[PDB]
């Protein structure tokens, strides 16, 4: 498994980045999660806010909730110093303070990185649309007649309708993963295809 940081940052809500694996990557402002597969580490910021704790632990239920036991998550105060977290994170040393990780609230106006597409071949050719960015993605738009496309800003979803077209359906992951190539994403940006009607833990956790 590849493993991977994420950064939960903001004041009225919660924008999610991968970054870079490292410790510098890290600030003492915001909240961030180790994902290693099996092992899924929360870090709180001695000066995380109180949203950004909460969202991130929202996200390490829904990962678990969607793993089935295969993961488990952990909680851990950057004053822990938690081993755990800084081998599997491969490095160690100071922490950048929270005034080094920008204000939560410019990031709340400015960091909006989730967009919303559909995939739709109702007019008889193959359409992919950006329907919605940032705060504007809402659940409301998923359509049961067609596929759609979301980025977390940590991930790739490709949801099917229930009543998706046979050539949407068979072609929905790969304009899930071809989003990822022309966005200009990282390239092991994870990329999952979902079924309408499932529990769907982390996609459903973007919306809440
Ligand atoms: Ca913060
Ligand atoms: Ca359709
Ligand atoms: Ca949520
Ligand atoms: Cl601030």
């Not at 903001?10 to 597969?37: C, M, Q, W």
């Not at 678990?64 to 081993?83: H, K, L, M, Q």
Request: glycine share 10%.
């Amino acid at each position: 498994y590849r493993t991977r940081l994420l950064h939960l940052k903001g004041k009225k809500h919660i924008r999610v980045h991968e970054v870079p694996k490292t410790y510098k990557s890290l600030n003492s402002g915001d909240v961030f999660v180790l994902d290693a597969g099996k092992t899924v580490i929360q870090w709180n910021g001695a000066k995380a806010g109180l949203l950004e704790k909460v969202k991130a632990a929202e996200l390490l239920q829904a990962i678990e909730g969607e793993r089935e036991g295969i993961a488990s998550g952990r909680v851990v105060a950057e004053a822990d110093n938690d081993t755990e977290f800084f081998t599997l994170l491969g490095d160690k040393g100071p922490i950048a303070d929270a005034a080094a990780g920008g204000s939560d609230l410019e990031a709340d106006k400015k960091d909006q990185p989730a967009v919303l597409l559909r995939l739709s071949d109702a007019s008889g050719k193959f359409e992919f649309t950006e329907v919605a960015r940032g705060l504007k993605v809402k659940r409301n738009l998923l359509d049961s007649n067609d596929v759609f496309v979301l980025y977390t800003g940590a991930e790739v979803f490709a949801w099917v309708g229930k009543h998706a077209s046979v050539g949407e359906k068979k072609k929905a992951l790969s304009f899930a993963q071809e989003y990822v190539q022309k966005a200009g994403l990282p390239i092991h940006t994870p990329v999952a295809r979902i079924l309408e009607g499932g529990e769907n833990e982390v996609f459903e956790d973007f919306f809440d």
